[PDB]
Amino acid sequence: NSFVGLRVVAKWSSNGYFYSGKITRDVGAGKYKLLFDDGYECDVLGKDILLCDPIPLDTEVTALSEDEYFSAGVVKGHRKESGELYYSIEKEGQRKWYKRMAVILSLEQGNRLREQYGL
Amino acid sequence: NSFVGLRVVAKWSSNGYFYSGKITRDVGAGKYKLLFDDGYECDVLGKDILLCDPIPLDTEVTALSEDEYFSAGVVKGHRKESGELYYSIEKEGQRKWYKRMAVILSLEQGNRLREQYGLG
Ligand SMILES: CC(C)(C)NCCCNC(=O)c1cccc(I)c1
C-alpha cells in the first residue's frame, strides 16, 4: 500500500553510508522524507533507500564501535530485547551484539541489496 | 596545545542537536573538521562545538533508543569497558546504560554547557 512508517536503511549524502531510518512521508517526485535513528530528518531519493527491516542474515555490513568506522562483518542473527533490535555480527569467527543504530552499510555493501530491496 | 584528535559533542544545525564526534582538522576561520561517530565528516563552527569527553556528571541529556528521539535523562555515571565509554542515565529514579554514541544534547541542553565547554 504505502511505505510510510516502514523502517529502512538509506543514504542521504553523496559520500554516504546507508543508515538505519524510517520513512515518514511520500513527498512525491520519487522522494521520501526520512527520519534517521539519531533524529535527523531530510528528503531522500527512492534509489537511495533500501527497504530492509531488519538487514537480512548473511549480509555484509559495517558495525560501528568507539574509534571504529570501517569494521566489516556478516549479520548472523537478530534478537529483540525490550522492543529493541540487536544484530549478531560475525567478524573473524567471533560474534558480537550490536544495536540496530550501530549497523550501517558502505556504498559497495548497500549496492548488493539494491536490486532486491531498493526503491 | 591543539584541539585536533579531541572528542567533542557538536551541533548539527538542521535540528539543533549536539552529537558525539571528534576534531580531525583545523580548517581556519573558527571552523573545525569534525568526524561524527557514525563516520560522517564535515566542517563545524567552533561555537557549535563542546569540548566534552565525557559529558560531565549531572548533565541533562537526550538518550537515544529504538523509536525514542526525545527521551531526556541525567548523567549519573561513566564506565569504560573494552575501550568504550558508557553513560549511566537516570530517568524517573531508574538508571540505564547507554553507549556514548546514543547520548546527545538538544539545543537547550547543549546551551547549558556552552559557557564552560564551548569553542566559540
Ligand atoms: C546527524 C549526523 C550527521 C550526526 N548523523 C546523521 C546520519 C546518521 N544517523 C544515525 O542514525 C546515527 C547512527 C550512529 C551514530 C550517529 I552520531 C548517528
Residue numbers in the entry:
A (entry chain B): 1484 to 1602
B (entry chain A): 1484 to 1603
The authors write:
Our structural characterization of 53BP1TT in complex with the related compounds UNC2991 (Kd = 3.9 ± 0.4 μM), UNC3351 (Kd = 6.8 ± 0.4 μM) and UNC3474 (Kd = 1.0 ± 0.3 μM) revealed a similar three-dimensional (3D) arrangement wherein each ligand not only blocked the methyl-lysine binding site but was encapsulated in a cavity generated by two 53BP1TT molecules. This consistent burial of the histone binding surface of 53BP1TT by dimerization was unexpected. While crystallization could drive 53BP1TT homodimerization as has been shown for several other systems, that all four 3D structures were comparable despite differing crystallization conditions and space groups suggested that some 53BP1TT dimer may also exist in solution, even though all previous NMR spectroscopy studies only reported a monomeric state for 53BP1TT. Since the homodimerization interface in the crystal structures buries the histone binding surface of 53BP1TT, such a conformation would be autoinhibitory for chromatin binding. Titration of UNC2170, UNC2991, UNC3351 and UNC3474 into 15N-labeled 53BP1TT led to changes in several signal positions in the 1H−15N heteronuclear single quantum coherence (HSQC) NMR spectrum of 53BP1TT indicative of slow exchange on the chemical shift time scale. These chemical shift perturbations were more extensive than could be expected for just the small molecule binding surface and also mapped to amino acids located at the 53BP1TT dimer interface in our crystal structures. Several of the 53BP1TT residues that are close to the small molecule binding site had two different NMR signals. This is consistent with loss of symmetry observed in our crystal structures, allowing interactions by each of the two 53BP1TT protomers with a different “side” of the bound small molecule. Taken together, our data demonstrate that like in the crystal structures, the small molecules are buried at the interface of a 53BP1TT homodimer in solution.
The DNA damage response protein 53BP1 (p53-binding protein 1) influences the cell cycle dependency of DNA double-strand break (DSB) repair pathway selection. The localization of 53BP1 to chromatin also requires that it binds histone H4 di-methylated at K20 (H4K20me2) via a tandem Tudor domain (53BP1TT), while BRCA1-BARD1 recruitment requires unmethylated H4K20 recognized by an Ankyrin repeat domain in BARD1. We show that a series of water-soluble small molecules targeting the methyl-lysine binding cavity in 53BP1TT function by stabilizing a previously unknown lowly populated autoinhibited homodimeric state of 53BP1TT in which the histone binding surface of H4K20me2 is buried within the protomeric interface. Our work therefore identifies an auto-associated form of 53BP1—autoinhibited for chromatin binding—that can be stabilized by small molecule ligands encapsulated between two 53BP1 protomers.
